[PDB]
Design a protein around this ligand. Structure first.
Ligand SMILES: *[C@@H]1O[C@H](CO[C@@H]2O[C@H](CO)[C@@H](O)[C@H](O)[C@@H]2O)[C@@H](O[C@@H]2O[C@H](CO)[C@@H](O)[C@H](O)[C@H]2NC(C)=O)[C@H](O)[C@H]1NC(C)=O
Ligand SMILES: [Ca+2]
Ligand SMILES: [Ca+2]
Length: 189
């Protein structure tokens, strides 16, 4: 696992697909480990090419993980309101999108009366029961931006082992892949 520390003042890791083979997908799969004391941050954002409305965004609002996405139609929110993640401890998020449906999993190891921190998984599913086929495709994904600096909501804390549709974006940043740029106050562990 590759780990980055996002320090004070923000940082940005950006993966840019080659402009002539940008993926379009029905299903997206995001995994990421992190720790932060922030109650409000953007962690990951995938943007479609300019001129398209499509995006995927992983964030923390009021101390809980949520994902908001748009594949052409409406903004779709899936939140995990029962897991506090802003305690400075390690959490793992797993997000799968399928059309306008999504699964959001948040793993934690809570110490609570003090106890042995066995794992507590919390999964949320979100389905759209709309007769006929809706807009299901995330079109021409252009950038994955990690650290929230371009949303004005900079992440501060650790990020570990990010995985998005096959890409281990942090392993590629650490090895200086030509499609990754790293900026700001960032350090590799
Ligand atoms: C989005 O998900 C819907 C609904 O999923 C179905 O319903 C329940 C919701 O709780 C869920 O438990 C099941 O997993 C189940 O699949 C999908 O809607 C289905 O679409 C297919 C093909 O169009 C139809 O044959 C079904 O009638 C229809 N189900 C219903 C209840 O309308 C939808 O396909 C899916 N979208 C994508 C892109 O995967
Ligand atoms: Ca679309
Ligand atoms: Ca449908």
């Amino acid at each position: 696992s590759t780990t980055y520390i996002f320090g004070k003042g923000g940082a940005l890791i950006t993966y840019t697909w080659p402009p002539n083979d940008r993926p379009s997908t029905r299903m997206d799969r995001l995994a990421v480990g992190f720790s932060t004391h922030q109650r409000s941050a953007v962690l990951v954002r995938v943007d479609s090419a300019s001129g398209l409305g499509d995006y995927l965004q992983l964030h923390i609002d009021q101390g809980t993980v949520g994902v908001i996405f748009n594949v052409g139609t409406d903004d779709i929110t899936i939140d995990e309101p029962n897991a506090i993640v802003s305690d400075g401890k390690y959490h793992v998020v797993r997000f799968t999108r399928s059309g306008g449906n999504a699964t959001l999993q948040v793993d934690s190891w809570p110490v609570n009366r003090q106890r042995i921190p066995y794992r507590l998984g919390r999964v949320v599913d979100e389905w759209l029961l709309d007769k006929g086929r809706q807009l299901t495709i995330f079109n021409s994904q252009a950038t994955i931006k990690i650290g929230g600096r371009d949303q004005g909501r900079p992440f501060q804390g650790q990020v570990s082992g990010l995985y998005y549709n096959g890409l281990k974006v942090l392993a590629l940043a650490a090895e200086s892949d030509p499609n990754v740029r790293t900026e700001g106050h960032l350090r590799l562990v």
